[PDB]
């Protein structure tokens, strides 16, 4: 409260580690459904459906210009990918299994980097 704070986690190493984390996914052989926003033109359902579109290029340019203001919301646009995909596209398909490896790499890269 007023006067009153909990001890101060440094916070300085989270944009640093925020991009090595997302190096990582950029990288792994399964992100190419995740890499680029999906085409509004070209897929069917997508625009009317996905209320919130999020991408690891959409992602990266955001971290890269000081829009996350802290490492949960950096986390929360993360796990929309995921979330998304799992709204558009059945578990049995390459996209569906593809994000649900995506998600299990990137949760645990979080755990072990921050907690």
Same mark, same amino acid.
């Given at each position: 409260?007023?006067?009153?704070?909990? #001890?101060?986690?440094?916070?300085?190493?989270?944009?640093?580690? $925020?991009?090595?984390?997302?190096?990582?996914?950029?990288?792994?052989?399964?992100?190419? #459904?995740?890499?680029? #926003?999906?085409?509004?033109?070209?897929?069917?359902?997508?625009?009317?459906?996905?209320?919130?579109?999020?991408?690891?290029?959409?992602?990266?340019?955001?971290?890269?210009?000081?829009?996350? #203001?802290?490492?949960?919301?950096?986390?929360?646009?993360?796990?929309?990918?995921?979330?998304? $995909?799992?709204?558009?596209?059945?578990?049995?398909?390459?996209?569906?299994?593809?994000?649900?490896?995506?998600?299990?790499?990137?949760?645990?890269?979080?755990?072990?980097?921050?907690?």
């Amino acid at each position: 409260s007023m006067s009153v704070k909990k #001890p101060k986690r440094d916070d300085s190493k989270d944009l640093a580690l $925020c991009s090595m984390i997302l190096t990582e996914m950029e990288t792994h052989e399964d992100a190419w #459904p995740f890499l680029l #926003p999906v085409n509004l033109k070209l897929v069917p359902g997508y625009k009317k459906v996905i209320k919130k579109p999020m991408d690891f290029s959409t992602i990266r340019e955001k971290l890269s210009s000081g829009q996350y #203001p802290n490492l949960e919301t950096f986390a929360l646009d993360v796990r929309l990918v995921f979330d998304n $995909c799992e709204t558009f596209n059945e578990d049995d398909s390459d996209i569906g299994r593809a994000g649900h490896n995506m998600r299990k790499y990137f949760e645990k890269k979080w755990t072990d980097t921050f907690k």
